[PDB]
Design a protein around this ligand. Structure first.
Ligand SMILES: COc1cc2c(nc1OC)c(-c1cc3c(Cl)ccnc3[nH]1)cn2C
Length: 289
């Protein structure tokens, strides 16, 4: 505890956003949580009164992890409020919701105001996710669960990595395993490396290219388990840019050592990102330069 903690009176909840894992996430304003900013619009993660514990510790610790992180492409944590009423945490507001939800919305099936992404807007999207992964791995971190559902999208369309439920250190489990996003080795030996995160990135890229469709439709997790351990692979989406699919296949090399690194992935596309990347991105930063 200590330090990150901030006054409960400095956080006022405006309206509700949506039910979250632990509790209904809200949107509000925080007093003095950002330099040069009197007030800041934020997202309030709360927990239900139900789990008076045996989880409230789990909650605050997932946020404790975020403390270590500080990147443009990784949702920023702007304070926690442990000791007190509803144990909550406040962080950088991502008005547009998770990438999976945002992508689902672009599909015509649910008629609009935004057209599907463009091969360009997809690279920018891939590259942003990758920068954040590149940074996470750089600080000796593994996500273990990288998927569209755990990426947030900001009003200005910036995509960042905003969920660290399974994110542990390179060094029970109430809930299903992200079978469909898991590498072969992860599925086989319970192994998790930066390399597996990459394998998952690939799946994320597939999600983008199919607008967050279900990976391996028809197959059950078990079947996926098998299928993938035998070298199985998802097909090339309909109308997928040759470029994008190539990047997928690269992330799915069976051999964990043959797959590219996040830094490597960024470099293969840096020439196609949007100008402003060169500044804000961790990649071109001096903390890796
Ligand atoms: C109704 O469903 C939802 C709609 C949402 C959000 N969440 C929902 O469900 C949880 C968020 C959102 C969640 C969140 C978090 Cl956890 C941390 C930081 N920023 C965040 N923004 C924005 N919209 C529009």
């Amino acid at each position: 505890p200590d330090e990150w903690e901030v006054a409960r009176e400095k956080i006022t909840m405006s309206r509700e956003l949506g039910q979250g894992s632990f509790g209904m996430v809200y949107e509000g304003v925080a007093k003095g949580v950002v330099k040069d900013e009197p007030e800041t619009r934020v997202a309030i993660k709360t927990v239900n009164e139900a789990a008076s514990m045996r989880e409230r510790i789990e909650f605050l610790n997932e946020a404790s992890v975020m403390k270590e992180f500080n990147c443009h492409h990784v949702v920023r944590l702007l304070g926690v409020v442990s000791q007190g009423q509803p144990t909550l945490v406040i962080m950088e507001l991502m008005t547009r919701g998770d990438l999976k939800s945002y992508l689902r919305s672009l599909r015509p099936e649910m008629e609009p105001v935004l057209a599907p992404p463009s091969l360009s807007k997809m690279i920018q999207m891939a590259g942003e996710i990758a920068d954040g992964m590149a940074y996470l791995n750089a600080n000796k971190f593994v996500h273990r669960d990288l998927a569209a559902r755990n990426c947030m999208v900001a009003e200005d369309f910036t995509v960042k990595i905003g969920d660290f439920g399974m994110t542990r250190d390179i060094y029970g489990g109430k809930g299903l395993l992200p079978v469909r996003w898991m590498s072969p080795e992860s599925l086989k030996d319970g192994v998790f490396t930066t390399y597996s995160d990459v394998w998952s990135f690939g799946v994320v890229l597939w999600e983008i290219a199919t607008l967050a469709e279900q990976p391996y439709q028809g197959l059950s997790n078990e079947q996926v388990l098998r299928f993938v351990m035998e070298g199985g692979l998802l097909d090339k989406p309909d109308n997928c840019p040759d470029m994008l699919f190539e990047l997928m296949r690269m992330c799915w090399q069976y051999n964990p050592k043959m797959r590219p690194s996040f830094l490597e992935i960024i470099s293969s596309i840096k020439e196609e990102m949007e100008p402003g990347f060169r500044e804000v991105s961790f990649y071109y930063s001096e903390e890796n330069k």
